[PDB]
Amino acid sequence: IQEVQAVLPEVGWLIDGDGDNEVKFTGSSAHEVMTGIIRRFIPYMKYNYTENTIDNYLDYDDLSSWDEFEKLTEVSAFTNFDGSLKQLMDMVTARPFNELFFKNSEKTPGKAQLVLRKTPFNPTEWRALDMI
Amino acid sequence: TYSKIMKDLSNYGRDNISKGIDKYTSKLSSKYKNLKKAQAKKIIEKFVKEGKVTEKEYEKITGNKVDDELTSDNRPKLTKDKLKSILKEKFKTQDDFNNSKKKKKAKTDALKELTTKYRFGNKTHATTLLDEYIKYKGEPPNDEAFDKYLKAIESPLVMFSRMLFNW
Amino acid sequence: MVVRFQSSMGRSLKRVDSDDLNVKGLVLATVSKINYKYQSVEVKVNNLTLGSRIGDDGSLAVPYPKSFIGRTPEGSVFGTKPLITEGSVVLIGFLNDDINSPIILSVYGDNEQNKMINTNPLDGGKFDTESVYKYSSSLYEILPSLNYKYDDGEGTSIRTYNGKSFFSMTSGEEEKPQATDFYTGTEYQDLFTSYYGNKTLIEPRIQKAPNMLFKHQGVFYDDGTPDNHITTLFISERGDIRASVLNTETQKRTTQEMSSD
Amino acid sequence: SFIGRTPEGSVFGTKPLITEGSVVLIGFLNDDINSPIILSVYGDNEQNKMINTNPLDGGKFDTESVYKYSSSLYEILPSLNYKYDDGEGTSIRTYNGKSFFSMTSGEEEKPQATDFYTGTEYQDLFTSYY
Amino acid sequence: SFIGRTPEGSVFGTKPLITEGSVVLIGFLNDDINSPIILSVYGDNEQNKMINTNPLDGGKFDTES
Amino acid sequence: GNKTLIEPRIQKAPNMLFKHQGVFYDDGTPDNHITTLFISERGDIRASVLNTETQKRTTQEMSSD
Amino acid sequence: KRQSKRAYGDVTIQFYQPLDMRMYIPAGTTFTSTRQEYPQQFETLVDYYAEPDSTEIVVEVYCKETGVAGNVPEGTINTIASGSSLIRSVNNEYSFNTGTKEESQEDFKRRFHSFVESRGRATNKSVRYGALQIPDVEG
Amino acid sequence: NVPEGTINTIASGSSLIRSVNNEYSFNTGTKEESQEDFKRRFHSFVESRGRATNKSVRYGALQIPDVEG
Amino acid sequence: PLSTILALDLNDNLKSLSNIKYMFKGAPKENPFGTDKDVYIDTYNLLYWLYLGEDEELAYPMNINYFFTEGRFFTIFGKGHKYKVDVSKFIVGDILFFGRSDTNIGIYVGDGEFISMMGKFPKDETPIGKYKLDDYWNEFNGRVMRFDEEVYI
Amino acid sequence: PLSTILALDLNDNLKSLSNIKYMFKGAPKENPFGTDKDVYIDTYNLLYWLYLGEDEELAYPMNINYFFTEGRFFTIFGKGHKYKVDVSKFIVGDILFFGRSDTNIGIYVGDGEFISMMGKFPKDETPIGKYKLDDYWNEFNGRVMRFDEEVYI
Amino acid sequence: LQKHIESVIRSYLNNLKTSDDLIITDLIQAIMNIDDVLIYDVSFDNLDENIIVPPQGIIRAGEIKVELK
């Protein structure tokens, strides 16, 4: 949005990036950032379901990443000009070091799950995958 | 409003006013539309250099009744018969109509008191009355000439964005 | 078909990918905050702020252009620190067209601001005309202090200091009033350069009179003896003038003094 | 900075100082490699930190107090004698050896440009330090 | 060179000299034609050669001479 | 650079002056001391101190002769 | 019955510094608020010009929605679209209290009584109704 | 229960803020109450059914979860 | 009009006003017209004394800053353009400016002439006189103003 | 400590030290405390004489350049920030700086006061005296230093 | 709240028809209509008696000063 001041009479906000639509997400790991990113917009995405919204049908939990090697992050909402949340989701993912995809929830049949985990090419993480 | 003007200068102080006299001048002229930019520019210069402003400095800048505190609380109504009387004071002889030079002096003196002293003031409205008054030699064919001042005083961007949404 | 349901954009079909993430060209921003210790600002996009990481000032910021900077053979560093202003519009060029890689190219003012800070009354005309050269050719500059400096293609040149004090020079007899000393001298309001573009006087920020001095000294010279001659051209705020020559080690002085009276 | 020719024909312009080992931003013509131009010269964070006398870490430029220190056209010639201007009335210029020219109006700043006894020393001026 | 406004409100800045027939580098906004800005002013090789008194053809800047 | 003298555009001699004045100071009294260092085109030098309100002046003048 | 009247009122603009040159406000500038209780928009009908050396300007505004929601309390309308950086604060000094809903059943009933009693011409009540039937005049 | 001087930044724009610090340590961060604590709390609750007693006012004022002493 | 009548009166009395003498910034306290004694007056002070005779007062010394903000004038032609064909459209009583920095001004009179004081800078003894506009047209600077009394105050 | 004891002694003897007089850069060769005769000393020279009485010597004239590289001090608060609430944490004997270009310095004493010489510039006859910090707090500049003797040399 | 009361009273003063006395009961019922519970009582100093208006009089202007007890 280009032409919105959002001022107030003789009052103002101490944090910068206020009045304007700027939003900042901060976390020391991908699961901390991705939680804030998804949780920021998911509830308000409303639909005409007789029973809820996407948050009941998508768990988007049990996320992890390289917390020890990744410092604190200041990822900006508008890093991509009028892009989709998927475009902004890719930046948070930091591929190929972390693997993001949508797949059925075997642990909870009947509903889908958003997966965000460190790549399984590590030796112990490779053994952690279920064999078939 | 000599007191209020002086108080305002004393509120900011000579140290603060001395930094940006042109724009601080605009603050005073914004608050009170009786002072023009030149009038409020000169009083501030005299304030900073001398360090104070007296009633001699104020009246020298512009002729005002400094010794009159009535007006801010109460200022008279100026119903129609009062205006009829004040015109009879400002124009007492017929030569004033014939001699334009004094007529300009007379009418300015009428407007100077008539806009300020009473409840309601307007230049263009009062001018209009004076131009009709002068033309009819001070006795127009209708009393409306004396009513007049009293009754007169008291897309392409949108269209493109709309049609674009419609399609 | 079923497989076409992928990232796409435009009226014509275009594969959106990691090319679309990369910005093409230069963009404008406003200076919201400045790091005075490092002199590296953080610029705000219309709804985003660049630079500005956890790093306070040194390890991350946006660089600013410099007139010149370098180091001498002795090792000492030299350079410039051009004035930085908040709320000015600055052009930005990203490195390798990567977002999250900003640099400021230059600082461009608004049309109103540019119209205010120029005394050229000509609407237009070729620069090669002799008459247009009189007004066009004017290196007009104003310091952070509201006292300004002026040069021109003609012999007129004007410099200003605190209060109404100024220095001026000229050669044409037509322009003789601009730099005259008849009676009390030329007033500051007589100089046409002292007005803004919109018929407004360029007030000095500080009205108190300055005090100047030209102090001269050294250390040694080719004769080998230590230098100990000190001389000054001090001028006081009350109008006094004092030209003095001093030898401090020998405790000798000769002064020529003028009092305000 | 600027360059041109006068109606008489004589050419005028400037020659800004050029330094070896400085970092310069480059913009290729029509995004062609083998078509370089220099846009500007940017110094290092250490170099910028050395050549500024502003002690404030940060603050809005609109604050009166911050205006005293922020508003400083501080410049140093190739010669290590420097030139200084400020939004206040202080202004300082230096020449070979310890000689300098200075001016000021505030009584607080009166020592910076005084001539009492032997005059103010060059080390008394805060702008004379890195 | 620099432009801004003081806390008092007064505007300050500079007006660098402008010359006709000089070569100027231009950078379009968002790489859009019909969006020009001038980046800087570069002179010709002859003009640069005329307005410098340096007789040295070349050499490292670190040399005392 | 090409072995040519840099002619000045204007050959007429200038006239310099260093005019000094103010408005007030910390004492609070109005400032009214005026001093100049005028130099004429004929080589004259005039250092003067003036108090305009009190109508007093002391000049040190040098003539071209 | 006649339809509802759009709310309208005055809005006050505060700048950081007095304008150095004359500025033009584009027509159809949108004034709004940030409180969730009053998301109702406003818009100007005529041109306005901000002359220099003026630290404030007041322009009238009309509520686009036709209802009582425009009667916002004091200090509600704190937003301006297409506003320059010069603007410091936007604030209404006084609540509108001018918007109205559809005409009240009782006022309609009373005006209809006036009309019925006014069928016999040449009487006080007939003159009364003939004077009151203009929508602008009141009481 | 971070140590002293741990919270350095506000993780936002912080235009007018220089630095943030805490002079005291966090001690209220505690794990879930063990069986023994629950038994102690419950014995005070059983003994606190009669009002107008010091042991009653103890539970009276201890009922808020945040209060420890 | 007032300005045209005053310019005509000055033209008619121009030959009797030889007592008035030229100076750079002559601001005498004596009225030139009310005294047979010679007196050194410049163009600005001259206009001030000429307008002061009637009921209008203006202000003193009436330097260049007077025309900026007092609102007594409205510009007819701006500075920086200089057309010789549009000189005929002028009218008597319009103020003519001279010099690159507003050094001197004049009063226009018909037949392509103007009234002003011209002479060497250091207090010339030449009296007031009328000169042709042809030789001075180079230093005209295109700025022209006009008076208005009815609406002011 | 040494600096606190010296500040307390100076406070106790402040009323008997009226012989000492203010000047801009008074660097006399006579010790003020060892002579009944009046003498013009500035704050830097005063601190030098005060520290010289004991076994510490420092250096002369002890200008602003002394604090930069001699390593006799370690900064407590940097220049360019100015907080009124953190003044209470100070301790007696801390050096307080004044002026935008280090024009003058002071010694802090408790109860929100400081010891310094203040007077008109051209060699004022006012003797040394103690002033409240409230009026001078504007020109404090936030720079604060402290002494250390054990580890030096 | 003071400003809201002033604006409500001034608005009540406007939109009033011609030839009706300055009834105070309707004024107090109108200003109490805002909140029956919050607003306790209202009183006046000089206009406690109804001001009879002539046929050509309308009560529209008036300066309002709120004096909270």
Order the strands across the largest sheet of chain G as they lie in space: 7-3-4-6-1-8
Number of helices of chain C: 3
SSE order of chain C: HEEEEEEEHHEEEEEEEE
Shape of chain C: extended
What is the radius of gyration of chain C? 28 Å
Oligomer: part of a larger assembly
Major β-sheet annotation of chain G: 6 strands, antiparallel
Total beta strands of chain C? 15
Coarse morphology of chain G = elongated
Query: Structural class, judged by helices and strands of chain C?
Result: mainly beta
Measured distance between first and last alpha carbons of chain C: 99 Å
- The computed structural class of chain G is alpha+beta
* Beta fraction of chain C: 25-35%
Number of helices of chain G: 2
PDB class: virus
Keywords: bacteriophage, contractile
Entry title: Cryo-EM structure of Staphylococcus aureus bacteriophage phi812 baseplate in the pre-contraction state - core, wedge module, and proximal tail proteins
Chains A, B: Peptidase C51 domain-containing protein
Keywords:
part of a larger assembly; 11 chains; A: 132 residues; alpha+beta; two-stranded antiparallel ribbon; two-stranded antiparallel sheet; 4 helices; I: 153 residues; six-stranded antiparallel beta sheet; two-stranded parallel ribbon; 8 strands; 20% strand; hydrolase (chains I, J); NlpC/P60 domain-containing protein (chains I, J); cysteine-type peptidase activity (chains I, J); thiol protease (chains I, J); protease (chains I, J)
What report would you give on this structure?
This is part of a larger assembly, with 2 copies of chain A, 4 copies of chain C, 3 copies of chain G and 2 copies of chain I (153 residues). The radius of gyration of chain A is 18 Å and the shape is globular. Chain A has 4 helices and 4 strands, in the order E-H-H-E-H-E-E-H. Chain A is an alpha+beta fold and 132 residues long. Chain C has 261 residues and is mainly β. Chain C has 3 helices and 15 strands. Chain C is extended, with a radius of gyration of 28 Å. Chain C starts with 17 loop residues before the first helix and ends with a strand. With 139 residues, chain G is α+β, with helices and mostly antiparallel strands. In chain G, the strands form 2 sheets. Chain G has a 6-stranded antiparallel β-sheet with strand order 7-3-4-6-1-8, with no helix packed on it. A two-stranded antiparallel sheet of chain G has the order 2-5. Chain G is elongated. The two termini of chain G are 17 Å apart. Chain I is an alpha+beta fold and 153 residues long. Chain I contains 4 helices and 8 strands. In chain I, the strands form 2 sheets. In chain I, strands 3-8-4-5-6-7 form a 6-stranded antiparallel β-sheet. A two-stranded parallel sheet of chain I has the order 1-2. At the C-F interface, strand 11 of C face strand 1, strand 2, strand 3 and strand 4 of F. Strand 11 of chain C pairs antiparallel with strand 1 of chain F, so a sheet runs across the interface.
